[PDB]
Design a protein around this ligand. Structure first.
Ligand SMILES: Nc1ncnc2c1ncn2[C@@H]1O[C@H](COP(=O)(O)OP(=O)(O)O)[C@@H](O)[C@H]1O
Ligand SMILES: [Mg+2]
Lengths: 183, 52
């Protein structure tokens, strides 16, 4: 079967089946509970709008990103985001598809372990693999050497690679990124 | 005097022969290989596969 190449990121979740050119569904990763009271009855008001739906009703929501700086600070919301990504934006049950998450360098271990535990227990995938976000960006350029500066929205990290041999002692991770520029 | 001179001459003659005539066994190794050019003709591939 085909593999699911998900990419959590921080600010935009990008996902799609392996072997294409562009991600199938790209949508902000925000989960916003309503904050006002609500008087219309039977309007079908949900308790949390996630993804791109909460960028249209954002006038009466309190959007809050579940990923602060690479690390994940609110596991329930992240689980909700993943569930939405699998079932509504791709409509493929995870029981029949390998997954390939991505993770920033130098992140806490507990984050990665919890990620794999969720993927194996809740969604019950057949097999998942976690890859460093810079090696992939080096794949896409068709190179095999080079030093890649991957300035995302959560964290900016700079992984040098030569001839396929990564240099673990030369990774410089800096926490200034797009969110701090927005602020 | 001539005998002594010819002794050294004959002794050095064989050394010179071995040193020099044996060079003719091969001297083409100086010749380099092709090292051809492409002339913008070997641009017939996309970014599809790179590992192989
Ligand atoms: N065209 C653009 N010009 C300037 N900044 C941009 C543009 N597109 C996205 N950004 C910034 O980059 C962020 C998205 O980065 P992204 O690569 O999606 O992060 P991640 O690594 O989490 O996927 C946005 O928050 C935005 O601030
Ligand atoms: Mg990124």
């Amino acid at each position: 079967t085909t593999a699911l190449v998900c990419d959590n990121g921080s600010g935009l979740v990008k996902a799609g089946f392996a072997g294409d050119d562009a991600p199938r569904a790209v949508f902000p990763s925000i989960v916003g509970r309503p904050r006002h009271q609500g008087v219309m009855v039977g309007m079908g008001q949900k308790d949390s709008y996630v993804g791109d739906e909460a960028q249209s009703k954002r006038g009466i929501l309190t959007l809050k990103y579940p990923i602060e700086h690479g690390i994940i600070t609110n596991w329930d919301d992240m689980e909700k985001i993943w569930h939405h990504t699998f079932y509504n934006e791709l409509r493929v049950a995870p029981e029949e598809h390998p997954t390939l998450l991505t993770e920033a360098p130098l992140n806490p271990k507990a984050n990665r372990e919890k990620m794999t535990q969720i993927m194996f227990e809740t969604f019950n995938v057949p097999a998942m693999y976690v890859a460093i976000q810079a090696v992939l960006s080096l794949y896409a350029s068709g190179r095999t050497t080079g030093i890649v500066l991957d300035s995302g929205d959560g964290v900016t990290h700079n992984v040098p690679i030569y001839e396929g041999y990564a240099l673990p002692h030369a990774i410089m991770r800096l926490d200034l990124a797009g969110r701090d520029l927005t602020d | 005097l001539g005998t002594r001179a010819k002794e050294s001459l004959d002794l050095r003659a064989h050394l010179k022969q071995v040193k020099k005539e044996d060079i003719e066994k091969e001297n083409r190794e100086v010749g380099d290989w092709r090292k051809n050019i492409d002339a913008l003709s070997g641009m017939e591939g996309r970014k599809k596969k790179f590992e192989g």
